[PDB]
From a paper:
The sulfonamides (sulfas) are the oldest class of antibacterial drugs and inhibit the bacterial dihydropteroate synthase (DHPS, encoded by folP), through chemical mimicry of its co-substrate p-aminobenzoic acid (pABA). Resistance to sulfa drugs is mediated either by mutations in folP or acquisition of sul genes, which code for sulfa-insensitive, divergent DHPS enzymes. DHPS catalyzes the condensation of para-aminobenzoic acid (pABA) and 6-hydroxymethyl-7,8-dihydropterin pyrophosphate (DHPP), producing 7,8-dihydropteroic acid (7,8-DHP); this compound is further transformed, ultimately leading to tetrahydrofolate, an essential precursor for DNA and RNA synthesis. All three Sul enzymes adopted the (ɑ/β)8 TIM barrel fold also shared by DHPS.
We determined the crystal structure of Sul1 in a ligand-bound state, and the Sul2 and Sul3 enzymes in both apo and ligand-bound forms to resolutions between 1.74 to 2.8 Å. Comparison of Sul apo and ligand-bound structures revealed conformational changes in these three loops triggered by ligand binding. In particular, loop 1 is oriented further away from the ligand-binding cleft in the apo structures of Sul2 and Sul3 as compared to the structures of these enzymes in 7,8-DHP or pABA-bound states. Similarly, loop 3 in Sul2 and Sul3 also undergoes a large conformational change upon binding of pABA or 7,8-DHP. Finally, in the Sul2 and Sul3 structures, loop 2 undergoes conformational changes in a more confined space in presence of the ligands. We noticed that the Phe residue that is conserved across Sul enzymes (Phe178 in Sul1, Phe179 in Sul2 and Phe177 in Sul3) and localized to the active site adopted different rotamer conformations depending on ligand binding. In general, the sidechain of this residue and its environment (ɑ6) showed higher crystallographic B-factors than the average protein (i.e., for the Sul2 apo structure, B-factor of Phe179 sidechain atoms were 32 to 67, for ɑ6: 20 to 53, and for the protein average: 36).
Residue numbers in the entry:
A (entry chain A): 3 to 269
B (entry chain C): 1 to 270
Write the structure that this text describes.
């Protein structure tokens, strides 16, 4: 009911973590506890780097990396959304009882749906314009919201028809590179994602934190978009976003507390 | 009043010749801070000649003028507009002789003996409400709605000023915040949520200053206790609520945040 914050943790290496661009399972564990301490409700755990330029590791490598992280978060009572598009990793994560699966491919392979149907984990179904084609960087001609709605029309039908109950679904319309090169495309979705909540009567997750289009609206480099991110997340929250996936839970937590305190005053 | 949001960057001179990169800024360090804040997106520098900490010993008007004179020199040469934030009439008089763009008085210009000097200047006037109202020990407004008490303050003070020859459109209304409103964070929250009532009742622009006010600390959680994120959220809320001016210690996060909200609004309108 209240905004749920996903804290981003991406395991980047098998054994060497240096507190910068390299994250190992031991230190992934410390980052997860730190993000919960800063106000996250869930750790959105990625078994590999987010950048498409790194060599994609195997489902076997993803499982080996997340296995010790899942043991300790389960011990801590720390909820996990397992962020992987690889079905063998998804199946392993479901066997460990994760709270969510988060698939940047949006669960496109119907042969896998019986395994999704027999679990209770919630599914973050993400839209992208790539849809499996790295070369495809834009949606088809027309209104981006029209194409996203039509994507979810078809995919929700496929998933729920296979027995995945619709109240397990969380809709992620995509953001930044998953929508197109132009900042206007991401701004349209950030402004209009509640059209999807209303169309489907389903919750929406957004991930805007540190996305490149924010740097276009500010003119600053990578380590200076903290305020633009907070403003974008607060605007999403005020627009009714049910989940926000972020790198820095504390500024968002603090900002939300101010907004909550203001509306409670005007009641 | 229909123009875009105007940002005042806060710069206080807190020493005569001591600069430590932290709380103490001599005039040359205040010049460097003023220049930085405009580069970070301020439109005007709200320049205080002394510490705004109530536990600092107040300095004489002679000391205030000596501190601000070289800062006004430098900012005039830079073309940087100044709101001179001082409550001492002698300092205000000096600022007016230097042609500052605004005067900003935490006492709200309460002394009619000074009005003839206000009336023959062109400086815009930031008229600040406080529950102290000279009674510095007074910590709370009288019984009733705080917003009703603020409106009644501006009712009388606007009439007093405009009748003395100060044209109405020189006036900017600051309802006060934090200590100037009361001890309870709910009281500052009430003004932050409802100041639009003052814009409607007087048809005058409203200035808000929430930056780093202690009441925000009650809304941060457990942790180191940084207030920058809570400050930005309150300032963005004020902007969305129609604030004409925002006075802040950090213009850059606010400019960045406003640019996001503007692009979103433009997206929705088109
Ligand atoms: Cl287990
Ligand atoms: Cl819903
Ligand atoms: Cl201080
Ligand atoms: Cl001059």
């Amino acid at each position: 009911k209240s905004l749920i914050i996903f804290g981003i943790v991406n395991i980047t290496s098998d054994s060497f973590s240096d507190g910068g661009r390299y994250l190992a399972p031991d230190a992934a564990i410390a980052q997860a506890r730190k993000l919960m301490a800063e106000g996250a409700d869930v750790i959105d755990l990625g078994p590999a780097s987010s950048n498409p330029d790194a060599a994609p590791v195997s489902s076997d490598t993803e499982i080996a990396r997340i296995a010790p992280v899942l043991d300790a978060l389960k011990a801590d009572g720390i909820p996990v959304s397992l962020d992987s598009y690889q079905p063998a990793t998804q199946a392993y994560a479901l066997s460990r009882g994760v709270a969510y699966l988060n698939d940047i491919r949006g669960f496109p392979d119907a042969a896998f749906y019986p395994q999704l149907a027999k679990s209770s984990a919630k599914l973050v179904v993400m839209h992208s314009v790539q849809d499996g084609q790295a070369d495809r960087r834009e949606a088809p001609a027309g209104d981006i919201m029209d194409h996203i709605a039509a994507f979810f029309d078809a995919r929700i039908a496929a998933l729920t028809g296979a027995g995945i109950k619709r109240n397990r679904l969380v809709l992620d319309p995509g953001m930044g590179f998953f929508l197109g090169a132009a900042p206007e495309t991401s701004l349209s979705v950030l402004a209009r994602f509640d059209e999807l909540r209303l169309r489907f009567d389903l919750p929406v997750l957004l991930s805007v934190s540190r996305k490149s289009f924010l740097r276009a609206l500010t003119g600053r480099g990578p380590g200076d978009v903290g305020a633009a991110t907070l403003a974008a997340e607060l605007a999403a929250a005020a627009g009714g976003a049910d989940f926000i996936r972020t790198h820095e839970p504390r500024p968002l937590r603090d900002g939300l507390a101010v907004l909550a305190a203001l509306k409670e005053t005007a009641r």
